[PDB]
Ligand binder design. Structure first.
Ligand SMILES: [Zn+2]
Ligand SMILES: [Zn+2]
Lengths: 138, 87, 134, 147, 114, 195, 134
């Protein structure tokens, strides 16, 4: 059929400027990120430093859902550029430079030991009993 | 070291910023070397041959000159840039 | 050479090939298929372990060549472990006829009937490998 | 020991400008990698190798208590040559030590934590290969190691 | 032998026993998460560790110009006459003299020991 | 210049990869800094060697080392690396041909010098780390000639074996006929001679 | 609905996008005009059991770029944008990765040398003075 020898060629357009900047969001494969449950999400700059040069914080489904932290790619693409092709009704490809690259990793939510609490465990760090029990006590 | 390290080191140094409030900025950007020179009692420079350095117990050194750019801000929305060539 | 063996220090590590802390909840049904054949032989008339038995199991395989080189048989090794640990550990071993020499170890039944039922085996396993003297 | 030899052999790191060494997993926690999978992916590049996995187990247990980057940074800062007056200052100091003093050749920029983590993972991976006997120890006399 | 990580926080799963059912469970720490274990072996160490060096050997070694090459040991997989042979020469053996062979033919990284 | 070329070629940066891919790919190190990974290490080394021999982006003193067993390519560009020139061998044949010698013979009034040998890709510098991956021939007329195939994959050839000696050891006549310590004694004595 | 809400509509439609790595000169040529609405044509040819991707530079722009696809299963990538009106949205999900390579081999390095030399123009070296500064 035609698919056995189909040939597709489309024009490339590079708008001089766009109101919205383009950046790449990357999720590790082991994270098994799924967008079906992403009913709501929040993306904002971090508050630990306390803006344009600070890490980004991603929250999904408010506090109930998983939380991810994005960090700008330190390595710069001085000799390289990245572009994204998006299908359009006119049938011509459009390429947008990648303003930034961000790597997001999940943040597990649970009663993580506080800094003060960890000090007590440091005494028994070398010799501890029933690693499971330590979390139950906390 | 002469052709690269000396120049790289000076350019690596951050510009000097001084606040009194007028702001003074000093930047070292270009390096210059002359032939090994010796200065007499009268102060007349003459090229220093190594044998003269050996015989007269003179160190065989070359004068080092740096271009310096000085910009001054007087908190009056005026900027004046002056450069001292071959310091 | 017999005098040489009685002088050179030999520990369980030298004569043991590999060890594995198998779960083995029910001694009657062993996780290891081959182990089942001879384990049942020791379980027709169990002694001192009928009341209770630690769910965890420790299986150690003894290299045949090393055992023969030191003239060590399956018997005194069990006796030494029992003698060293008294009734703390119950030791069950196969017959030399089988191509593989095995020695199943479990914690005393009285303790089963405080540190950890699982991590304690590792402490014993490491301790018996080096500190214990055959 | 009873539990000393049960866990095995644990890895430690002696970072610059720190009085005492720290568990290796702690430095990974400070760099921003929290979960064990994330840290191990930087150290063990093949998860089908059971021998390599067992080597890091004692290190994970030692740093099991610390589970957050700020906690890890505070732990490093608490051991600094100039202990911080408060927790907030300690973290800033600890972050600065890692940012500049630790693996400076890898980078000094604020977004170089991943690069430093990968190299620190490589340092741990190289140590494991030596411990497992897969790679022979480096020779001080070998003149290609000299400058 | 297998190492399992929690599906929630991607942390290590450690063995645990449930007295209610008496079945091995790999329970996550600081995550109140549990999984149904199947291997039933929580720990195993081989002191002898007669690990087949063929697993550790890498097919790319055939590209090393410093390794000897023999025409007397053709590759069984493809019949190529040339092969690159070498010793493991790695610690933990105490006897490293047997030669491991790697087929020199490209796309056939077959490794064998005579 | 080294890093720019690697990025242009199929070298995946550390940031833009999944750690699961580090298993098969070879790590790329530049001056000790892990830059990225590569899938075709054999082609990368061939390209790097070709560029260096052409006095392209890579300069002559840049040393590329491939650890085939360890799946690592290390590139060094810093100072203090001791290296020596060696003749290149391809297909058991020196790239140094009679035409190179003839041009050298008329060294003056011809502008042909040692640099043209390096530019021509006939001789390249090899540092001690790179020498571990080099299969070296002591002489061309005895090592890479058709004979009992001790080795048929020579990559380099010594210009002359006597270049392993230094200034003071180079005045000893027939030093290969002397017991070695007496060659060490002469190197000390030759500095105290008169002239 | 809030300022920080992310418009995940693109994810719902499962829109597919391609990530391409291209050199500077190709982008540098595009950046020259960058307002003509045209920089070239992307040609994709498929066969019975093989597909090839190539790109052609515009004739006016110049006054062959074969494309090699890459696996995307090892990592999941998504594209999002930040609107100037503080309205973040998800453009789509990356479905394929490709790389752009130079067709030429020998003369291509000449442009690379000029690029390196051009990058060396800001780089500065010490200069000799024939006469002592007075
Ligand atoms: Zn968990
Ligand atoms: Zn083959």
């Amino acid at each position: 059929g035609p698919s056995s020898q189909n040939v597709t060629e489309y024009v490339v357009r590079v708008p001089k400027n766009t109101t919205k900047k383009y950046n790449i969001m990357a999720f590790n494969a082991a994270d098994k990120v799924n967008f079906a449950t992403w009913n709501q999400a929040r993306l904002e700059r971090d508050l630990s430093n306390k803006p344009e040069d600070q890490p980004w914080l991603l929250r999904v489904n408010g506090k109930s859902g998983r939380k991810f932290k994005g960090i700008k790619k330190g390595g710069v693409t001085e000799n390289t550029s990245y572009y994204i092709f998006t299908q359009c009704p006119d049938g011509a490809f459009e390429a947008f430079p990648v303003h930034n690259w961000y790597n997001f990793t999940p943040l597990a939510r649970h009663r993580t030991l506080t800094a003060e609490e960890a000090e007590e465990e440091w005494e028994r760090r070398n010799k501890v009993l029933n690693h499971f029990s330590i979390m139950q006590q906390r | 070291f002469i052709q690269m390290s000396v120049q790289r080191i000076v350019e690596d140094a951050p510009p000097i910023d001084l606040q009194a409030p007028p702001r003074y900025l000093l930047k070292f950007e270009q390096i210059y070397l002359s032939k090994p020179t010796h200065w007499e009692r009268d102060g007349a420079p003459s090229p220093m041959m190594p044998n003269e350095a050996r015989l007269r117990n003179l160190t065989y050194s070359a004068p080092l000159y740096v271009d310096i750019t000085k910009t001054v801000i007087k908190e009056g929305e005026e900027q004046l840039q002056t450069q001292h060539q071959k310091t | 050479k017999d005098i040489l063996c009685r002088l050179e220090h030999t520990t369980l590590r030298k004569v043991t090939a590999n060890t594995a802390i198998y779960y083995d909840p029910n001694p009657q049904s062993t996780v290891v298929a081959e182990d089942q054949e001879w384990v049942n032989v020791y379980y027709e008339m169990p002694d001192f372990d009928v009341a209770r038995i630690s769910p965890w199991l420790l299986r150690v395989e003894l290299d045949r060549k090393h055992m023969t080189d030191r003239k060590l048989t399956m018997e005194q090794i069990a006796e030494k472990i029992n003698a060293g640990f008294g009734d703390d550990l119950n030791c069950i071993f196969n017959d030399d006829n089988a191509e593989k020499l095995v020695l199943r170890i479990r914690i005393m039944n009285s303790d089963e009937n405080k540190m950890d039922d699982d991590v304690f085996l590792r402490c014993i396993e490491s301790n018996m490998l080096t500190d214990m003297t055959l | 020991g009873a539990k000393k030899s049960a866990i095995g052999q644990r890895i430690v790191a002696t970072l610059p400008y720190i009085k005492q060494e720290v568990p290796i997993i702690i430095v990974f926690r400070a760099l921003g990698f929290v979960s064990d999978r994330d840290i191990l992916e930087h150290i063990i590049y093949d998860f089908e190798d059971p021998e390599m996995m067992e080597m890091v187990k004692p290190s994970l247990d030692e740093a099991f208590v610390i589970q957050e980057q700020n906690v890890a940074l505070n732990f490093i800062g608490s051991r600094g040559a100039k202990p911080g007056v408060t927790k907030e200052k300690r973290i800033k100091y600890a972050k600065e030590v890692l940012q500049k003093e630790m693996l400076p050749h890898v980078g000094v920029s604020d977004f170089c934590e991943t690069k430093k983590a990968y190299f620190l993972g490589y340092m741990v991976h190289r140590l494991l290969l030596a411990a497992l006997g897969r790679r022979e120890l480096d020779d001080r006399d070998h003149y290609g190691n000299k400058r | 032998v297998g190492i399992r990580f929690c599906q929630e926080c991607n942390n290590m799963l450690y063995p645990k026993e449930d007295k209610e059912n008496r079945i091995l469970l790999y329970a996550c720490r600081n995550c109140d998460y549990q999984q149904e274990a199947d291997n039933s072996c929580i720990y195993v160490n081989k002191i002898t560790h007669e690990v087949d060096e063929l697993t550790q050997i890498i097919a790319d070694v055939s590209q090393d110009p410093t390794l000897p090459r023999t025409e007397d040991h053709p590759c069984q997989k493809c019949g190529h006459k040339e092969a690159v042979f070498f010793q493991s020469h790695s610690a933990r053996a105490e006897d490293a003299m047997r030669l491991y062979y790697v087929c020199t033919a490209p796309h056939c990284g077959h490794r064998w020991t005579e | 210049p080294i890093l720019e070329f690697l990025e242009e070629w199929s070298m995946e940066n550390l940031e833009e990869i999944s750690p699961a891919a580090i298993a098969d790919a070879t790590k790329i190190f530049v001056n000790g800094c892990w830059v990225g990974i590569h899938k075709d290490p054999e082609q990368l080394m061939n390209t790097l060697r070709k560029l260096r021999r052409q006095m392209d982006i890579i300069v002559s003193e840049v040393s590329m080392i491939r650890d085939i067993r360890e799946r690592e390519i290390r590139i060094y560009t810093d100072a203090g690396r001791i290296c020596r020139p060696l003749l290149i061998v391809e297909k058991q044949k020196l790239l140094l041909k009679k035409r190179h010698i003839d041009q050298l013979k008329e060294r003056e009034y011809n502008n042909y010098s040692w640099q043209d040998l390096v530019a021509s890709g006939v001789v390249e510098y090899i540092d001690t780390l790179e020498e571990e991956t080099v299969m070296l021939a002591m002489t061309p007329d005895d090592l890479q000639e058709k004979e009992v195939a001790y080795c048929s994959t020579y990559t380099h050839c010594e210009i002359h074996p006597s270049m392993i000696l230094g200034v003071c050891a180079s005045i000893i006549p027939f030093p290969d006929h002397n017991q070695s310590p007496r060659n060490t004694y002469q190197s000390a004595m030759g500095k105290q001679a008169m002239g | 609905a809030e300022r920080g809400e992310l418009d995940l509509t693109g994810a719902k439609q499962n829109t597919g996008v391609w990530l391409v790595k291209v050199p500077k000169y190709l982008s540098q040529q595009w950046a020259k005009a960058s307002g003509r609405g045209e920089v070239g044509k992307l040609r994709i040819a498929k066969t019975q059991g093989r597909t090839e991707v190539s790109f052609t530079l515009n004739e006016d722009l110049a006054n062959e770029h074969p494309f090699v696809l890459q696996s995307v299963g090892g990592q999941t990538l998504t594209v999002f944008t930040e609107s100037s009106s503080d309205k973040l949205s998800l453009e789509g999900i990356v479905v394929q990765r490709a790389e752009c390579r130079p067709a030429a081999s020998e003369n291509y390095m000449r442009l690379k040398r000029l690029q390196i030399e051009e990058s060396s123009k800001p780089v500065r070296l010490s200069q000799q003075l024939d006469k002592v500064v007075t």
